[PDB]
Amino acid sequence: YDIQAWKKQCEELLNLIFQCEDSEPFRQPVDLLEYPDYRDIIDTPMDFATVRETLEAGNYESPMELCKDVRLIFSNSKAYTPSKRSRIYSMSLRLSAFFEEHISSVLSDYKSALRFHKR
Ligand SMILES: CS(=O)(=O)NCCc1ccc(F)cc1
């Protein structure tokens, strides 16, 4: 029932994501010099360095907010892809599965801790 435990759990999951080769296209903001269809199709860019810096700045109140930003990395990749078979999009699907598999307990524990706090 530790209401704060999610933050270090998210830091460690981000470390695992950065070690994963599938995170390479998503570690830093998309290069607008390399990708021109970018801001015309993506309204809210997101990447893992931005997520890590928001977390480290104390600018996430809950792991749900972090999850929303990580899910935006994946939905931006899906919206920008010219094909479901593209390399970057295929990497995003595997990385998303890995992320969802690991964030599930973080979210469950935090929501349970908050329910206990408010009992
Ligand atoms: C940091 S980068 O060197 O510009 N690589 C970005 C690859 C990418 C391009 C479009 C997307 F929707 C998602 C990822």
Characterization of this structure:
The chain is an all-alpha fold. The protein has a single domain (1-119), classed as Bromodomain-like (Histone Acetyltransferase, Chain A, Up-down Bundle), CATH 1.20.920. It is built from five helices and no strands. α4 (63-80) runs antiparallel to α5. The longest helix has 32 residues, at 87-118. It is elongated, with a radius of gyration of 15 Å. 18% of the residues are buried. ~{N}-[2-(4-fluorophenyl)ethyl]methanesulfonamide binds at residues 25-26, 28, 30-31, 34-35, 76-77, 80, 88. The PDB classes it as protein binding.
Q: What keyword list fits this structure?
A:
119 residues, Histone Acetyltransferase, Chain A, binds ~{N}-[2-(4-fluorophenyl)ethyl]methanesulfonamide, PH-interacting protein
What's the SSE blueprint?
Blueprint: H1 6-19, H2 38-41, H3 48-56, H4 63-80, H5 87-118
Helix pairs in contact: 1-3, 1-5, 4-5
The chain binds ~{N}-[2-(4-fluorophenyl)ethyl]methanesulfonamide.
Organism: Homo sapiens (Human)
Protein name: PH-interacting protein
Domain Bromo: 1-106
Short description:
The modification Phosphoserine is found at residue 90. 65% of the residues lie in helices and 0% in strands. The protein is mainly α.
Approximate shape:
elongated
Distance between the termini: 12 Å
- The CATH H-level superfamily is Bromodomain-like
Question: Which small molecules are bound?
Answer: ~{N}-[2-(4-fluorophenyl)ethyl]methanesulfonamide
Name the structural class: mainly alpha
CATH topology: Histone Acetyltransferase, Chain A
Largest sheet: none
* Sequence of secondary-structure elements: HHHHH
**Can you tell me the number of structural domains?**
1
CATH class: Mainly Alpha
Number of β-strand runs: 0
Radius of gyration: 15 Å
Which percent bin holds the helix content? Answer: 55-70%
Strand content: under 5%
Number of helices: 5
CATH arch. level architecture: Up-down Bundle
Modified residues (Phosphoserine): 90
Domain Bromo: 1-106
Subunit structure: Interacts with IRS1 and IRS2. Interacts (via bromo domain) with acetylated lysine residues on histone H1.4, histone H3 and H4 (in vitro).
Protein name: PH-interacting protein
